[PDB]
Amino acid sequence: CSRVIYKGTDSLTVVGRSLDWKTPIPTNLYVYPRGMTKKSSDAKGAFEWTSTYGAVYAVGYDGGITEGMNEMGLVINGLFCKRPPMSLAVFVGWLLDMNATTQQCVDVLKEHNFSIGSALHWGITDSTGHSVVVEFDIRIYEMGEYRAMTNDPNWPAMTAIIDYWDKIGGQNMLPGGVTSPSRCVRANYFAHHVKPTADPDLAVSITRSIVADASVPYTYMILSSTQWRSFADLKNLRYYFDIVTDSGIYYVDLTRLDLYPGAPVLKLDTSKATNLTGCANSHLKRSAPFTPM
Template sequence: MCTSIIFSPKDHYFGRNLDLELSFGQQVVITPRNYDFKFRKMPEIKSHYAMVGVSLVAENYPLYFDAANEKGLGMAGLNYPGNADYKDFNPEKNNVSPFEFIPWVLCQCATVAEAKDLLANINLVDINFSEQMTLSTLHWLLADKTGSSIVVESDKDGLHIYDNPVGVLTNNPQFPKQLFNLNNYSDVSAKMPENLFSSEVSFDGYSRGLGSRNLPGGADSESRFVRATFNKFNAPKTDNEQENVDTYFHILHSVEQQRGVDQVGPDKFEYTIYSDGTNLETGVFYYTTYTNKRINKVDMNHEDLDSEKLICYPMLDQITFNEQN
């Protein structure tokens, strides 16, 4: 399970929570402009936009969970089990495997509008990275620094590209159903509730926060979709980078999963391995991990973005304490 958002105060911040029961040794990976991207069925791309995000690197190839490029386009893949359906090779289409989908788009597109044009002829083809590393069942959120976002879902009945007016994505069900479900929470508010029950009955506002009392609190994807959307649209916005980044992570952490509450097998529990976000205007990447809530920062502009080699940083996940006395 995962949650991805775009948060748009002064600048635009795009990223996600990665929720799984085990870690894959992921790193912060910067792909510079001249890294030679090879694709299974498409021509290689030797020169492209630089990008930064979280990735597993296998055979010197970045398998991005999420990333954003230097032009301000971000993309994240989220679990979509039971619905994701990848296709056979189609000679009339651009055949891209899901494991190479994020770099294929971020290499070439600077905006959501450009991505829509590129995706008009795409076929997400069923090709595994290797026999040991098979494809994950995914759908994707894309967003840019205009605040626009779309969802891409490859279902049994074909490829669907949806405009996303809320800039949030979790997992199942299909995105239109998630969006429709928000109708059930139209009365939720950050304000104290008005008495609409009856003018003949008086109520005691016994607690602050009663307007949000009916927000769903579960770890399931529908609950997280509603909660993340509500928290995002009610979050404060300032002109201060540090305050906005802090608020962004509060939104993601409000739907994070702690170990022990989402059992997926015997003694196995899904949890939020990391939360991350990129300032799409500046290319600065931020992240926290389950055991390190300090906001860590990687600025791809400090690297040689014209090089040919991947630049990798381990994710800092040590538990630390500020000793004040």
Template sequence: MCSRILWNDNGLAVISGRTMDWPESTQPVLTVLPRGMKRDGGIADGQVIVKDNQARWTSKYGSMVTTVYGIGTADGFNERGLGVHMLYLSETDFGPRNPAKPGLHAGLWSQLLLDKAATVTEALALLDKVQVVMVETNGHKATVHLAIEDANGDSAIIEFVNGKKVVHHGPEYRIMTNDPTYDQQLVLLKKQDFSKPSSDMPLPGNVNATDRFQRAAYYAAMLPKPKTEREAVASVLAIARNVSVPFGAPYKDFGTYNTEYRTAMNLTDKRYFFELTTSPNVIWADLRKFELAPGLPVMVLDPDNINLSGDVTGKFQKAANAPF
């Protein structure tokens, strides 16, 4: 489970945010990846996932990401201001393998876009040239869909349903959660009238994906124009907290899991904010302060450290090995 919020019309900066809701730690590591890195989309954790015509590429842009299980990127953005968010969707079906197209496993789906695309339009064109392939790790299949946005405020939701790619492209697509598929979520949202909010207006309050989608849409429409980045990021994180699932809540039996972490991105100014739900502190880092030239080391930071607080840009360390 997860939720994504995009605030692209506030007049100050393009801000996006998300929650990561999962039954266990996804082993998140904040990671800065330089340009010029060679990737193999057919390999995950040393295992061959795509056996024929693997997608291979060299990164054009540097990026700052949160990794998932050490095999791919769950969330992040690149130096051009393209942001990505990988969320759970049980109906995901990438279809049978087509060896005529270069294949990459779903854990690196979002990283390919960060490595090679500067805008949503470029990212969508790039996806036409490859095939995403299912991968499994820690006993979980990557049944995921993807939200992407850019520093111009453009947005897209990408899903694979019954083996077919479905794209919702446009700046109006600001909210995303999980099941049902996005077209059905939009139909359900239209049944609610949040145009004239009031203190006694009934608001969906459950932790399921449909209620979280509608609640996030309601609060996103009410945000006041921010005067500073601090206000803008606080607004998006406030919505992310509103649609979070309390840590340790006993919802596993009906398929909803507690929130592990929350992030916010300032795609205009290239700053990344991270909040681990088991830590009382928000931390952030500025991608513009990292050297991203080819050949420079990958830089990492483990956010599971209660002593971390505020600007942690200078606390990243050289990684012994690149995660992928």
């Protein structure tokens, strides 16, 4: 994974994110309205919650939420990193359903009133640009001025490598490898050295170019090839998505969807959207909630 934060002008913030894996990971888009009651897990002692906000989920294998953006502009991305039970399939949605800002996610995660059941670490950004890194004891790191976030190593060891290369100068040398530190240093440098703009369509084009450079070429094997990329427009509530083999990039506009209590669940089958561009709201079909694995 490679997660980039682009802060344009006029409070415009775009969060890029690319999925790198040796095998294709079937991921579909699900739009959930408010008022839905979900369970934390299927084991004994699991708790429930009613979704306060509506959100769109990038559900991999139609079983677990890899990432998502809610109607408040809150974005949470899950990245690989080598008490009441809280499954990983609904952990991202539980924070999206109940919280509106990054600070609200930090307060709930600081309580740690849950257990979790090859692992992951998350990055949470709100519409205000406040971004943190959550890594498991739970450790919440404030990104501050950092813009990129990949897999390994941990965040303290990552910022050390970032500060080491920042003294060398990105204008002079950057690591061109596919390793997570190499992709993080490149993405962080480019995120600081691109022009800030107020146009939402241009900010996604700029964020796409940074994520493209930090992307692993497809079928790379001498095998974490980039499978797909996502870009969240936090100010305009647009969630972009594209498969690296498809011909068009499309977005789901939450401001044009019915997220009220009682609305039906919509689903975008990405396997049937190979040539779709522009807004993909009309291609959302009324479906049932995905079954947690």
